[PDB]
Amino acid sequence: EKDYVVIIGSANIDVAGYSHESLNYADSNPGKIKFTPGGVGRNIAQNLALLGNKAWLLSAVGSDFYGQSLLTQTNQSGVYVDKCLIVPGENTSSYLSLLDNTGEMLVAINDMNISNAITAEYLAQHREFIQRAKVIVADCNISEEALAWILDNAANVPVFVDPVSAWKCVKVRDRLNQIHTLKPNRLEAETLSGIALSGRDDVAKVAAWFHQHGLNRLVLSMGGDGVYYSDIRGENGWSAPIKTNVINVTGAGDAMMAGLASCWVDGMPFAESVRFAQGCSSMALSCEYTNNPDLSIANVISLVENA
Amino acid sequence: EKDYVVIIGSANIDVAGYSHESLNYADSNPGKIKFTPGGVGRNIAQNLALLGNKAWLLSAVGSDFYGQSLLTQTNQSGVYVDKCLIVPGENTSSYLSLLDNTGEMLVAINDMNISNAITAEYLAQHREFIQRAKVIVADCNISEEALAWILDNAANVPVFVDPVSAWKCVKVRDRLNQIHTLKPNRLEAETLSGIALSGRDDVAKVAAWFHQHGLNRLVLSMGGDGVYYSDIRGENGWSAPIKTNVINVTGAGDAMMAGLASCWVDGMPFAESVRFAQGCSSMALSCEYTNNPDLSIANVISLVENA
Numbered sequence A, B: 001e002k003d004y005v006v007i008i009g010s011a012n013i014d015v016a017g018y019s020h021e022s023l024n025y026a027d028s029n030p031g032k033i034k035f036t037p038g039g040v041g042r043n044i045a046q047n048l049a050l051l052g053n054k055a056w057l058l059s060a061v062g063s064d065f066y067g068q069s070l071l072t073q074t075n076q077s078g079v080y081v082d083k084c085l086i087v088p089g090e091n092t093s094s095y096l097s098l099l100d101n102t103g104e105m106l107v108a109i110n111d112m113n114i115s116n117a118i119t120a121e122y123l124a125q126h127r128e129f130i131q132r133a134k135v136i137v138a139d140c141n142i143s144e145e146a147l148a149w150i151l152d153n154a155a156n157v158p159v160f161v162d163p164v165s166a167w168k169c170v171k172v173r174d175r176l177n178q179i180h181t182l183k184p185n186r187l188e189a190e191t192l193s194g195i196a197l198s199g200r201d202d203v204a205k206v207a208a209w210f211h212q213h214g215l216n217r218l219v220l221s222m223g224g225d226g227v228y229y230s231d232i233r234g235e236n237g238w239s240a241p242i243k244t245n246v247i248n249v250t251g252a253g254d255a256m257m258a259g260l261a262s263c264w265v266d267g268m269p270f271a272e273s274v275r276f277a278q279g280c281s282s283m284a285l286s287c288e289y290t291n292n293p294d295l296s297i298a299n300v301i302s303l304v305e306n307a
């Protein structure tokens, strides 16, 4: 009772549609449409609840009914959504995705403007609660002002930051000294550091840069080459990817971030926390949904000790 | 007053997305996504509630949370959704729509399969309630078995039928003798009758065909030419379109159908009911949403006494 994690990020509705018999353009074509809960912050929060952590989501949804049902589904994942800001006169953010029979994304749209409602004033209304969490997880979907507020008011609570995308990660560059753990991929790390990752001989170089700019811990996902982890105190290593039957790649990074934060709270060492996080992402990859409902400590452990 | 109307049709979630700039295929492109309640039956029910009728919707939605929010949103329009079947283990039906800068339809997907959960057994569980309505409105999204059940068990309650599309209207052809009022467009009428509507000289013939196959009343929407109405007892005429600011064409027919049924309940003559229904369609056209929230008897009336 009372150890908890705060997750400040975006909460979305992911709508995935594919036509079943080819695409007759400029015509309604019969197919399959799915509404899944999405958004980096929300997804991470869910994975944290599934990993047995008391998780509070600090996000923004619309005054529309569908946002409130998003909050409801998330709440029945175990997540505490009671502090989520509901914005009047605005609509809940969403990720529209047009795929095909195979499952290859043809085109996609995103309406993530309400992420800007996650304002510094809002988190300031929860300052003390935030400062009494065991760890804070933030995604870079929020504004530069909001992230800056978080990093400036963390009161020595470790902030784990998900850089999200190559475009959205840049807001992190000048504040690496305020981040406990960053989890970029190849493109994000290259974009931040300004150093190309053509070979693995480059990762050290990249890591050095990060450490020179004040980053405490780096968790660099290199996809099939694996994960490179580096601690500013000198510990660094490679973790091979978990052999996984990949059916859907969505939700992988979210599960990884959740694994990292959860393991930090559980007092686990860096390397084994990374392996565990890889196990979480592995569970995410082997699932059709963004969040694998079978994500558990026991099953991730089982998956990991398979190797 | 415990006079009520029953609407048996589909309940959907319409998801409309358009990009702010030019669509870069195979990439997440920033835009705006809107979730509006849709589905011919549901929309008609809503317009009927807005026209001041106690309206009961008999539809099917999924066990997912978004379906329950669809039902809720509909309920706060005044519609009674308490008899709506909620189907376990499946997803609420939906209409995915990819638009562009202007608002021009690029592509569309539809997942309306749960419409066939609206079964004859389900309607049979509400047989007497259905048979005590002042009017039954049915759309052709339901299965032929379901429509057949309705028309066979109406107990002399007038059934107003919305043919929906050229593909789904055909299930009506052999049961025209069981329908009080049919509201087809040009294409639907041509598809049913097997007679082309190239000119105005053809509408009479089309009407004759319909009457010879047992249809009581025909309300033939001809778009810019207007509406041709025909009673099997010999009354027939033309009603010119109400000059309207076409902003969104969606929801026009739903508003028209609702107008027709509502006017029938209010004891209005055929022609004047058609004019009123046209006024409803005018209000629908003047709105960006599928349902104009300002749809009222007073406002439609004001609109119609304008010329």
Ligand SMILES: [K+]
Pocket: A247, A248, A249, A250, A251, A252, A284, A285, A286, A287, A288, A289, A290, A291
């Ligand atoms: K997945």
Ligand SMILES: [K+]
Pocket: B247, B248, B249, B250, B251, B252, B284, B285, B286, B287, B288, B289, B290, B291
């Ligand atoms: K409209």
